[PDB]
Write a protein that binds this ligand. Sequence first.
Ligand SMILES: [Zn+2]
Ligand SMILES: [Zn+2]
Ligand SMILES: [Zn+2]
Ligand SMILES: [Zn+2]
Ligand SMILES: [Zn+2]
Ligand SMILES: [Zn+2]
Lengths: 67, 171, 156, 134, 255, 242
Amino acid sequence: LPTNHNKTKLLKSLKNTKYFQQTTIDWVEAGLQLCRQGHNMLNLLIHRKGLTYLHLDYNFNLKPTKT
Amino acid sequence: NRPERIQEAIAQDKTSVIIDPSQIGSTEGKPLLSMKCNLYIHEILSRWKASLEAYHPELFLDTKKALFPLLLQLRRNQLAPDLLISLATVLYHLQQPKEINLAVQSYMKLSIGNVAWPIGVTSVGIHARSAHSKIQGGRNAANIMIDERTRLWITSIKRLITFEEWYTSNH
Amino acid sequence: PRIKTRRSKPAPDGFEKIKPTLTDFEIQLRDAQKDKSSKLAAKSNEQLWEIMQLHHQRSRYIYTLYYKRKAISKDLYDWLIKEKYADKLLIAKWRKTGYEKLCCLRCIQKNETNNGSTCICRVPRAQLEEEARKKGTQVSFHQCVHCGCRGCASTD
Amino acid sequence: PEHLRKIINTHSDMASKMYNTDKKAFLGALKYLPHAILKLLENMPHPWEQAKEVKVLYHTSGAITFVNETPRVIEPVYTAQWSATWIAMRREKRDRTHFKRMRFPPFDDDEPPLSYEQHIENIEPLDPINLPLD
Amino acid sequence: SWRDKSAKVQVKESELPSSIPAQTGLTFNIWYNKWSQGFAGNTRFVSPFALQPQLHSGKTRGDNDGQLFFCLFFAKGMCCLGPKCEYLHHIPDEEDIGKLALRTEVLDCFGREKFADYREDMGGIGSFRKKNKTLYVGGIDGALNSKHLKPAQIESRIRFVFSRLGDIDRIRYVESKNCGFVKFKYQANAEFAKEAMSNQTLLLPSDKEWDDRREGTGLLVKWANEDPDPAAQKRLQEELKLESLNMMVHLINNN
Amino acid sequence: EPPPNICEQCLGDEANIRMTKIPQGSECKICTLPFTLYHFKTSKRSNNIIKTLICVRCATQRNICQCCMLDSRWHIPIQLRDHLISLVNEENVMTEEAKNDMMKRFLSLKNVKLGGAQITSDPSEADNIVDKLKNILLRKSFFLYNIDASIPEWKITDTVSQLLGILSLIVNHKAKCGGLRFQSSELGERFVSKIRGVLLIDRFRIFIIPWSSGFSAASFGTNTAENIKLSLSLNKLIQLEL
Ligand SMILES: [Zn+2]
Ligand SMILES: [Zn+2]
Ligand SMILES: [Zn+2]
Ligand SMILES: [Zn+2]
Ligand SMILES: [Zn+2]
Ligand SMILES: [Zn+2]
């Protein structure tokens, strides 16, 4: 059974800040931007740890550059 | 235009071949040393035109095709420093009577020389350690076999070494 | 804008008369979408202010041709509303009294400011000069943050 | 949309000092990344439509891009649209003598993902799977 | 003077070098914006931009906004937005440091945050515990591109360079250790000079090495320690006691 | 959850000041422990944002405020109020600041008011040390001689500028000598008109010389062994003047 007092959602809790903004774009542009942003976030997760030799390819294949 | 350059550079071609062993280490005289290294190879090929009738009449045209980049790159000082110094070491050891073995020693400091792992064994075995990457080279101090056209004249240098051996032998 | 599909209608008559202005706005957006060198942060936000200015001027142009000058019919205006050449909400705030000149939708929301008030670009320039005279200094505000408008209240 | 698109274009360099807190935002947006994946794949465009212009929230730093709306479809319309694509794909498997499946993955590993505005927005889309309704 | 004119565009946006550093490794670490898998060759470099105060001073938006935090890239000499920069594009004078009297022992004169104590390298922003006015000036070897000079000429060049950057207490070049100790009237002048002569050169345009200016590694302006000879400790203790007697008078006038 | 120490000078000359609390804002700049950070603006339209940079326990250990980092009672630096307490009580009350990280955390978590914080804490001993303070206060180039090492270059610029109406200057302190330089012809004539005359800065006498040579710093000496020797010889020349 779902919770009944779940007035909080995820995106409805993010509209109410000053940081997220509403717009209308193509679905393909939204998908290409989530690919670009997912590549940036996983690349920064890799690069904060110092794993600069793990060249995360653009198709999200993690490959070590060297042995 | 061009025929006046022919006149000037053939009148300069007929105006020294003895490489001073101080001028090999003298890096300031790099154009003069490069021109002397050009002209002594020209003198070798001029001698090999003369004794062609009984020693390899098939490789004279091939070596003329193959040294054309080296004749291009020696007249107007177009080579690498260590490559030119080692070539001048060869051609200085190539003018002396019994220094044919020292000429090929200078050739083997030309062709391989200082650099360890000349080609590179390129990840042999199973384990492929982290240090095992520095023992292969496609660039970054690997060899001086870095071109077909470059190695072609490097090979032609020892072709002229073998002719110099045969020429000083049967005379 | 929005891509041209089969489900989208063709444009009503009169749209080819206004195509050079919207096409100029389109090619200026095409130039302004590309990333510049853009090393600083004060001049990174200006290249968003150029795009907010272009979108504001495009919606202002469509508002001007429909409500002010009465040259575009209701069919062509509703087609320019469907194809997202201009926002419903910016034009709707321009229909209101007191929000005739307006920077953007972000600078009238009291929900996004830390103080629960509107943005400083909605204050008139004369009121900022009155408080600058009452404090003694100059007007310490030049360029708004969400969009680059120096002052966008209905008077100034 | 151009404001969103400029933010995403300015976050391709990411080498200045100014991106530091923005880079913090990227590592914070991973624990809100996969929700957005569902919000893509719910709003995935169906074969009878060309491209579905969708609402979407974007962070100010362009960290995460949540497709906002939920795909609601009338139930008999939904099964009729999918049955029309069913019969159309049966016709175009039967009448087509050679069917060419896609390559997988469609791009190279070395190729960066393409920008929407320079390669897709200026090309008009093709004709979707539509049965010819008499 | 500078109160009359406006501040100049010292560099265009396109005429800045990129934030990606000189390649000191194999691949670029985009979190810390640095290089890895190798450390050979200096990260440090001669800065391409100098200050040139009398030309490039002027009145910005920061005078209109009433802010009195100075500009870190005026001191480096590399602001794009010249007359529009939010900070101040002139030399810290007496009245500006006088309006900095409330915050200059917490922040510096650039808005950066002063930390607990110095670094192990003694270079950076500074402390809120020492009222530090003396700047160590090392790195003179590569600042001259290893040119043989007498020490009096180098001391003259350092005196003329740091005379552009505010009021000077005392400069003493050390012939035995190849370093100077530039002490200023105010703390903010020392902060501004440390940011100003960060990694520049002492080379004059009248010398032949002006084309190869940006070859080696430039100056090293850092915060200095106390002056451990007992005569300067004596002058330090007596000037601190005189300033304390002034503050005695202030505390009696307050209560 | 203690309220912050922010004195009357950081907040400023307003009655209604709106600050922003962030719980566990940042590490404090004394002990690197996190704390509830309060940032605000002095006016409503101030360009400078002013934030607390130390935690409450590090504030009450030094009896200082969190923003301007000066005393809560007196609004003066920590080092100088410790120096004043050393002047009063004849006891070198110093603030023992840590340098190791664990020592910073350890020295902030303990319940004590270290340094000179205990004296200025209660107003009774504050006014006691105040009237003890009252009891204490009841008890075209030129060359320059006679510059003791307590005379800076900026005072030598300022007094010459004050006697004129407003030009560079070169002073070798290890040689204890001075020099002045400019370009205007009339400025040297006006410097002669507003007088080997004597410059009186703070009763410390500096003799002047019209120095027709164009001095560099090499004219004051090439080395440090020349500077002290020339200073001794020039002090003997001053004794020859006297
Ligand atoms: Zn506005
Ligand atoms: Zn706005
Ligand atoms: Zn606004
Ligand atoms: Zn600036
Ligand atoms: Zn603390
Ligand atoms: Zn305070």
